Structures are given as structure tokens and as C-alpha cells.
Design an enzyme around this catalytic site. Structure first.
Site, PDB file in Angstrom:
ATOM      1  N   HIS A 118      -1.371   2.281 -19.424  1.00  0.00           N
ATOM      2  CA  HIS A 118      -3.020   2.568 -19.870  1.00  0.00           C
ATOM      3  C   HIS A 118      -3.498   1.182 -19.851  1.00  0.00           C
ATOM      4  CE1 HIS A 118      -1.198   6.283 -21.931  1.00  0.00           C
ATOM      5  NE2 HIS A 118      -2.012   6.685 -20.747  1.00  0.00           N
ATOM      6  N   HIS A 155      -6.231  -0.519 -22.213  1.00  0.00           N
ATOM      7  CA  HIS A 155      -6.808  -0.432 -23.340  1.00  0.00           C
ATOM      8  C   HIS A 155      -7.966  -1.257 -23.301  1.00  0.00           C
ATOM      9  CE1 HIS A 155      -3.771   1.976 -25.871  1.00  0.00           C
ATOM     10  NE2 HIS A 155      -3.407   1.832 -24.424  1.00  0.00           N
ATOM     11  N   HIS A 158      -8.017   3.479 -25.110  1.00  0.00           N
ATOM     12  CA  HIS A 158      -8.154   3.470 -23.932  1.00  0.00           C
ATOM     13  C   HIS A 158      -9.385   2.817 -23.161  1.00  0.00           C
ATOM     14  CE1 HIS A 158      -4.666   6.792 -23.199  1.00  0.00           C
ATOM     15  NE2 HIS A 158      -4.384   5.574 -23.833  1.00  0.00           N
ATOM     16  N   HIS A 192      -9.225  11.800 -22.269  1.00  0.00           N
ATOM     17  CA  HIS A 192      -8.160  11.165 -21.594  1.00  0.00           C
ATOM     18  C   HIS A 192      -7.808  12.222 -20.353  1.00  0.00           C
ATOM     19  CE1 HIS A 192      -4.394   9.492 -21.200  1.00  0.00           C
ATOM     20  NE2 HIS A 192      -3.765  10.433 -21.257  1.00  0.00           N
ATOM     21  N   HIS A 202     -10.085   8.714 -18.603  1.00  0.00           N
ATOM     22  CA  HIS A 202     -10.557   7.210 -18.872  1.00  0.00           C
ATOM     23  C   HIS A 202     -10.478   6.349 -17.761  1.00  0.00           C
ATOM     24  CE1 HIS A 202      -9.150   8.893 -23.322  1.00  0.00           C
ATOM     25  NE2 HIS A 202     -10.668   8.909 -23.101  1.00  0.00           N
ATOM     26  N   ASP A 218      -6.873   5.198 -17.635  1.00  0.00           N
ATOM     27  CA  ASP A 218      -5.724   6.188 -17.504  1.00  0.00           C
ATOM     28  C   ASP A 218      -4.924   6.339 -16.084  1.00  0.00           C
ATOM     29  OD1 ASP A 218      -6.590   6.958 -19.935  1.00  0.00           O
ATOM     30  OD2 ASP A 218      -7.627   9.114 -19.131  1.00  0.00           O
ATOM     31  N   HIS A 242       3.456   2.785 -23.450  1.00  0.00           N
ATOM     32  CA  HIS A 242       3.660   3.406 -24.665  1.00  0.00           C
ATOM     33  C   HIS A 242       5.204   3.930 -24.540  1.00  0.00           C
ATOM     34  CE1 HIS A 242      -0.435   4.065 -26.037  1.00  0.00           C
ATOM     35  NE2 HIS A 242      -0.673   3.616 -24.862  1.00  0.00           N
ATOM     36  N   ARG A 296       2.931   1.918 -29.177  1.00  0.00           N
ATOM     37  CA  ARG A 296       2.671   0.715 -27.988  1.00  0.00           C
ATOM     38  C   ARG A 296       3.703  -0.162 -28.205  1.00  0.00           C
ATOM     39  NH1 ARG A 296      -3.788  -0.016 -29.114  1.00  0.00           N
ATOM     40  NH2 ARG A 296      -4.290   2.244 -29.274  1.00  0.00           N
TER      41      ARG A 296
HETATM   42 CU   LIG Z   1      -2.610   3.936 -24.272  1.00  0.00          CU
HETATM   43 ZN   LIG Z   2      -6.822   7.742 -21.839  1.00  0.00          ZN
END
Ligand SMILES: [Cu+2]
Ligand SMILES: [Zn+2]
Ligand SMILES: [Cu+2]
Ligand SMILES: [Cu+2]
Ligand SMILES: [Cu+2]
Ligand SMILES: [Zn+2]
Ligand SMILES: [Zn+2]
Ligand SMILES: [Zn+2]
Ligand SMILES: [Zn+2]
Lengths: 153, 153, 153, 153
Positions: D46, D48, D63, D71, D80, D83, D120, D143
Site C-alpha cells: 500500500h 500510505h 492508506h 479499501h 483507495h 491500494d 504489511h 507494518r
Molecule cells: Cu496498508
Molecule cells: Zn486501502
């Protein structure tokens, strides 16, 4: 006005050769390859976006793609500028070929001067391999040799 | 716009290094170099006209000279575009240098992309040595290493 | 309409710290530093053009210079946008400072977001050292620590 | 023309890697990934909202979500901007991937420059998981590594 360019290909894999480019005005680019030291059969053959060899062929970036399309075959509408498909290596591990292409100019904003041509270990699936890399790289495996496209006299 | 280029230097001499170019818009080009395996002292450092390495550094042709002037110092009016003077090599065989210059753009008609950087064996006399080669090459001796100027960004 | 950014500064040197940026609308940028592990005295303090740390601080490129000027003091007309002058380190090797500057915005085409703030080993001669590096880097020596300027909540 | 960005990944978990972004004109963004030190299988990948690493990866915020959606998977309408789905880690703890996406530009108002990429601990359920976190984070857990998206070219 003829523009001329040449790439001397090297690699850590013992595959070598040259690729010679010419373009009269803003017509097609003629590209003549002479390759050695390759596994027999089809090999992915690309213009990558960069001529950065600070980390060998790995630093030459992704496929040259000014049109923001997906990976395809030279003949496809939906292709990268740098997608020149597969070159066929003979049983002696050489290839000699001329292709003509309309998306690899040697002048103007999309010039490939100072970018790298790259020969791959494996065939280019031309975006049709149904593999996760098909639609981005054609899943052609390692960058066994590459050369910066340098201006020729 | 921010344009980047890089030359990866090589030769028959065991001398190596990287020369990084950046140009923001049509401001001056910044060239940043770290070189190794060179003889201590001053070395002539130039952009040559061609990116052809099919005959190693010899095929990169003469000093890039779009204006058709004689050889000089970077600060002179009577200079080649390619005339970037001397870089200084330490007793440890390494050079570390930054220069700016506005005659080596990374885009447009006089773009150095796909041309070559060459480090010479000897000092550049900056066209002032009163030698028969002073006004063409600065009598900087042989091509010890060169690199095609590849597109980096 | 407040924009906030922060750099976490890393080195090979064991100098570290943070630089916090704020800009209300179109106004000047406020930059607050807290640094440690530095030699007492003045240190060159620059925004460099890139936030590339693939090669530690050396990949952050030259001084941020959208105007294509020469290296100067912050108060000079003839300066890089990145030229924030000298920060003063106490005997205990810490620095805490606030400066304001109107050439390092946090949005728009010349945004410093995702570029690197760099603290140098030596004083910045502010282009007045009479050194070959004065007009380009201010002769401020090694990049002892750098941080990518990241968007803050 | 060509904009480049690069994130150098760190975390508390011995995970390392580089993610390189390229955008030509206003085309899709190519993101090219080389990761190591990760547990085998799918991992949430992702962009962020923030590049604040003052509290490691936890300070990089949620995100990147400029359109104010839930999401989802990359190909979904309800997703997002940040994403980019799952990247697969081999048994050797390495991931090599090329992703193209049209919601993560490297310039203009929705620029990801100076934000963060995060890998992640766990698979992204792509919003489909029926968990309280499915429509926010795809329940992709910790994370494990992150890096600020630094301007590179
Ligand atoms: Cu994430
Ligand atoms: Zn997301
Ligand atoms: Cu390729
Ligand atoms: Cu020369
Ligand atoms: Cu600096
Ligand atoms: Zn392609
Ligand atoms: Zn000359
Ligand atoms: Zn400066
Ligand atoms: Zn660029």
C-alpha cells in the site's frame, strides 16, 4: 537526414553483440542485431526506459512506454514503444536480424538515444502468457545482456 | 523538468567510475564524478561527439563542438561545448569532483545524451600550452577511460 | 491552509536528528532542526534536489536549484533554492535552530516534499570561499547526515 | 516527460528492499519491487498518506485516499489510491514484482511524492474479508517495513 546509433551489448552471462539503429527523417527505425553466446530459441528483446548501467542491466529501468500502454507484441496496438518481441537464436547461439519499428525514433521527444536495448534469458510471452508479469514485462527472465544506444558518426 | 544522465567509465587500464549529470529546466548542467584506478595528477575531462564504443573509446570521435570553436578552458568563450578542463586524481588513484557548465544540456538540439565522456591520460593544457595540439585537444594524451552518457531520469 | 513535513536524518557517522518544515498558504517555510553527534561549529545545511537514498546521502544529487543560479548565502539573490546557509553546533555536538526561507515551499512545482535535507561535515563558504567548489557546493565537505522530507499529518 | 521516485524500505523485522516508481507524461505509474527478509506468501502492499517516519512505519498514517473511498482491490472502482493489493513472497523471503496503476501519480495534486510505501505482515483481503478492518486496511496486519517515496528524477 539519416540518424545512426549503435549499442555494444555486455552482461555477466557471456552473451555479447551489437544492435545498429538508423532512421531517415521521422520514418521507421531499422534495427540490425548481431548476437552471440545465447541459448537456442526465442529471447525477449526490449528498449528499456533508461541507459543507466551503474548496476549492470538491472538499472536500465522498465520498458520504454511513453504511450502508457500494457506489454504486447510489436504488431499489437496495445504495446510499449520498447516491445520489439522475440529474436530467434540459432543452434550455435548466434542471432542476425533486421526489424523495422515505428515507435523507437532516434530523434525528438521519444528518442531512444541514450536508452538501453536489453536481450532476455527467456521468451517474451507478448502479454499472453497469463503469468503475473505477462502484461508488464512479458515474463522474459534475466537481463542477460544490454547496451546503451550511442550516437554513431 | 529535471533531466538526469550517467556515464559508467571503462577502458583497458583497470580505471572505473561514475559521472552523474543533472539539469533542472534549462539551468546549467551539474556534473558529479567519482573515478578510480587512475594515475595521480591532472587528467583532461571532456564530452566527445559520439557514443560509438565499437572500437572502444577511440570511436567516440573528437570533443563535442556544436559551435565550431577551438579547444579552450571551461571559462573561455573560445572553447568546445565538451571542454570541461581537468579533474585532479589523488595518490590513491581516485577523483571526486563537481562542476557546473551551460554548454552540455541534457535535452534539445545540443543534448549530450548518447554522446560520451572521456578521461584522458594527461592534463588538458586548456589550449594555452603552445603545443601543435593545444587548439584542438589541449594535448591531453590518450583515452584512458570513457562512458556513453545514458538517460537516467 | 498549513502544510507540515519532517525529515528523520540518518548517517554512516552517528550524527542524527530531525528537521520539521511548516508553510501556511503561499507564505515562507519555517524549518526547525534538532541535531546531535556533530562536530562543534558551523555546518553546511542544504536542501538537495532528490530524496534518493539508495546510495546513502550521495544519491540525493546536487543543491535544489530550480532557478539555475550559483551557490550563495540564503540572504543573496544569487543562491540555490536549497541554500539554507550554516547551522551552529554547540560543544555538546547538538544543534537546535529555527530559520524561515521563501524558496523551499511544501507544495506547487518547486515543492521540497520528497527531496532530502543534508547536513555537511564543514562550514558552507556561501560562495565566497574563493574555492573551485565555492560557486557550486560552498565547499562544505562530506554529507554526514541526510533525511527525506516526508509529508506530516 | 519522465518522473522517477524510489523508496528504500526499513522496519523492525529485518525486511529490506527498494521500490522504484516511473511515470512517463500522465500515463500509469510503473512500480518495480525487490524485497527480502519477509515471511512467505501474500503481503499487503500500500501507499500510505504520510512520509512521517518519526514513529517508524506507524506514523505514515492510513492508506492514501484522496477520493475518499473504502479499501478495495487495485481493479475495483471502490478502492483507495494507495491500494496496490498483494505482493507474493517466495520461500526464500524475497519478492520481485512489477505493478502498474493509474491512481499513484508522481506529480500534481494527488502526487505520492513524500508519502510512504508500506509492506504489511499479512495478506490484503482486498475489502472482501468480512472483518471490521476489511474496508479500511484489508486487515493486512502489522507494518513490517516502509519507506518514504523520495523524488529520484
Ligand atoms: Cu496498508
Ligand atoms: Zn486501502
Ligand atoms: Cu526487458
Ligand atoms: Cu578529450
Ligand atoms: Cu549540500
Ligand atoms: Zn513491454
Ligand atoms: Zn576541446
Ligand atoms: Zn547551493
Ligand atoms: Zn525527469
Amino acid at each position: 537526414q539519416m540518424v545512426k546509433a549503435v549499442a555494444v551489448l555486455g552482461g555477466t552471462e557471456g552473451v555479447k553483440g551489437t544492435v545498429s539503429f538508423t532512421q531517415e527523417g521521422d520514418g521507421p527505425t531499422t534495427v540490425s542485431g548481431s548476437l552471440s553466446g545465447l541459448k537456442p530459441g526465442p529471447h525477449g528483446f526490449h528498449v528499456h526506459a533508461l541507459g543507466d548501467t551503474t548496476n549492470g542491466c538491472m538499472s536500465t529501468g522498465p520498458h520504454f512506454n511513453p504511450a502508457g500502454k500494457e506489454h504486447g507484441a510489436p504488431e499489437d496496438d496495445n504495446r510499449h514503444a520498447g516491445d520489439l518481441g522475440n529474436v530467434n537464436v540459432s543452434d550455435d547461439g548466434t542471432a542476425t536480424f533486421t526489424v523495422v519499428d515505428n515507435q523507437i525514433p532516434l530523434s525528438g521527444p521519444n528518442s531512444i538515444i541514450g536508452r538501453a536495448v536489453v536481450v532476455h534469458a527467456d521468451p517474451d510471452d507478448l502479454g499472453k502468457g497469463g503469468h503475473e508479469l505477462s502484461k508488464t514485462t512479458g515474463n522474459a527472465g534475466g537481463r542477460v545482456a544490454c547496451g546503451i544506444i550511442g550516437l554513431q558518426g
